[PDB]
Every structure is written in structure tokens, then in C-alpha cells.
Scaffold this active site. Structure first.
Site, PDB file in Angstrom:
ATOM      1  N   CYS A 159       0.875  -1.177   0.000  1.00  0.00           N
ATOM      2  CA  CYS A 159       0.000   0.000   0.000  1.00  0.00           C
ATOM      3  C   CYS A 159       0.905   1.218   0.000  1.00  0.00           C
ATOM      4  O   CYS A 159       1.703   1.366  -0.918  1.00  0.00           O
ATOM      5  CB  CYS A 159      -0.966   0.046   1.200  1.00  0.00           C
ATOM      6  SG  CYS A 159      -1.858  -1.510   1.543  1.00  0.00           S
ATOM      7  N   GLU A 161      -3.593  -8.609   3.105  1.00  0.00           N
ATOM      8  CA  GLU A 161      -4.568  -8.962   4.154  1.00  0.00           C
ATOM      9  C   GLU A 161      -5.833  -8.316   3.576  1.00  0.00           C
ATOM     10  O   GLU A 161      -5.731  -7.423   2.726  1.00  0.00           O
ATOM     11  CB  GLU A 161      -4.237  -8.304   5.500  1.00  0.00           C
ATOM     12  CG  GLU A 161      -3.140  -7.219   5.511  1.00  0.00           C
ATOM     13  CD  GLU A 161      -3.456  -5.955   4.682  1.00  0.00           C
ATOM     14  OE1 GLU A 161      -4.158  -5.025   5.158  1.00  0.00           O
ATOM     15  OE2 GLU A 161      -2.959  -5.889   3.539  1.00  0.00           O
ATOM     16  N   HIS A 198      -4.038  -4.543  -0.753  1.00  0.00           N
ATOM     17  CA  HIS A 198      -3.916  -5.041   0.610  1.00  0.00           C
ATOM     18  C   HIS A 198      -3.901  -6.585   0.588  1.00  0.00           C
ATOM     19  O   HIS A 198      -4.909  -7.204   0.275  1.00  0.00           O
ATOM     20  CB  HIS A 198      -5.116  -4.574   1.450  1.00  0.00           C
ATOM     21  CG  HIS A 198      -5.103  -3.117   1.799  1.00  0.00           C
ATOM     22  ND1 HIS A 198      -4.773  -2.661   3.056  1.00  0.00           N
ATOM     23  CD2 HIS A 198      -5.395  -2.018   1.064  1.00  0.00           C
ATOM     24  CE1 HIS A 198      -4.860  -1.341   3.080  1.00  0.00           C
ATOM     25  NE2 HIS A 198      -5.238  -0.926   1.886  1.00  0.00           N
TER      26      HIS A 198
END
Length: 203
Positions: free
Chosen positions: A86, A182, A180
Site C-alpha cells: 500500500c 490482508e 492489501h
């Protein structure tokens, strides 16, 4: 022997979700250590993550304020895997339209510029097409700017509202992912696994 993963926990934004994701994925392997990094007072990591959510300048501020710039640089030189996520991905570059005067980690030549779409920030899921090692599939994005670098450093590519941008970058052992991992469900668990798997090779 021991796999030393490190995640910069200082940078702006929720870093605990990446820590949980990285810890989940590292359970498939053996002898892996994961530590939150907020200072240079450590031995080089085999896998170092530069995460972050927020403004480009703030990110470079946290890194400097905590004397971690040179720490990251040593990892590059000593050929350890450094991977931005990110905000981290954008910080790998030289400059960003978001932080006018501010200079980045400059590990890869290129610039972060604002997306041309009116509908910002770019949220939802989107296809990422990697050139060679990571799983092609839909990953979850949340960003307003994107990298602009040389074709030779583009790892993965994605399209958003008619605009094709690098969603993944690469330069030697430097990796960068815009989305992302996750929050990117199953395929995201798989992506993080490949990152470990790459830092594991002693061959």
C-alpha cells in the site's frame, strides 16, 4: 536456519492486520520469526515489510523520525527482501504528487501520481495480472495515487476506470504491492505465502 521476518510498525495506518496476515501465512513454514520494527536497533531481516496507509509525506516522516531509512537501505544492499505494501509500495519511489517537496526512499526510479478517475479513492476488488511468480486473481484495493515506473520493474498490472497502472513492482529483491494482501481473502493469503517462500530460498 531461522527465518527472520520484520514489519515496520511505525508508519501511518493499521499495521496489525498485516501482522496477523503475515503470521497466518508463516504457519505453513517452519522456524519463522516475525517482529514489529520501530527502530534500527536490530539485526537485518531476511524479509522486511514497509507497510502503511495514509499520506506520502507522513510515511516518509515516520521513517525519518524513527531513523529507519538507512536501516531499510542496508537491507537492499545486503540483498534481503524488502517489500512495500500500500503506502509502502509508493514510498519505494522518488517522488509523489501527494507530497510536493518530499522525497521518497528512491529504491526504484519512478513517480507516484494521482489516478485520472473522478471516482476516488479506488476501492473494491480488481484483477492483478502478474508477470511471473504471484497468483493472478482479484485483490482488494484502497488507494488514490499509483506508481509510474519503467516497464522493466512492473511485476503486476491492474486496470481501473480505463487506466492501466502497476499494482505490483519489482527490482531485484525489492518487491512492491499496491493492494492489501490482508483483506484480500484467500488469494491474499497465497500471495503472502509466495513472498515468504521467496525469502526462504537459500539456493
Amino acid at each position: 536456519g531461522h527465518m527472520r521476518i520484520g514489519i515496520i510498525s511505525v508508519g501511518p495506518g493499521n499495521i496489525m492486520n498485516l501482522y496477523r496476515g503475515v503470521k497466518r501465512a508463516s504457519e505453513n513454514f517452519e522456524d519463522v520469526s516475525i517482529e514489529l520494527v520501530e527502530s534500527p536497533r536490530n539485526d537485518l531481516y531476511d524479509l522486511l515489510f514497509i507497510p502503511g496507509v495514509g499520506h506520502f509525506g507522513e510515511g516518509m516522516r515516520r521513517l525519518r523520525e524513527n531513523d529507519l531509512i538507512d536501516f531499510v537501505r542496508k537491507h537492499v544492499e545486503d540483498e534481503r527482501y524488502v517489500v512495500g505494501v500500500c503506502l509502502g509500495m509508493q514510498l519505494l519511489f522518488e517522488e509523489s504528487e501527494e507530497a510536493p517537496g518530499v522525497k521518497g526512499l528512491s529504491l526504484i526510479e519512478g513517480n507516484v501520481v494521482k489516478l485520472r478517475s473522478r471516482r476516488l479513492p479506488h476501492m473494491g476488488w480488481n484483477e492483478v495480472i502478474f508477470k511471473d511468480t504471484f497468483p493472478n486473481g482479484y485483490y482488494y484495493f484502497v488507494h488514490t495515487y499509483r506508481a509510474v515506473c519503467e516497464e522493466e520493474h512492473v511485476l503486476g498490472t491492474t486496470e481501473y476506470d480505463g487506466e492501466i497502472f502497476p499494482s505490483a513492482v519489482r527490482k531485484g529483491r525489492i518487491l512492491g504491492f499496491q493492494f492489501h494482501p490482508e483483506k484480500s481473502s484467500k488469494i491474499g493469503r497465497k500471495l503472502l505465502e509466495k513472498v515468504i517462500e521467496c525469502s526462504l530460498s537459500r539456493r
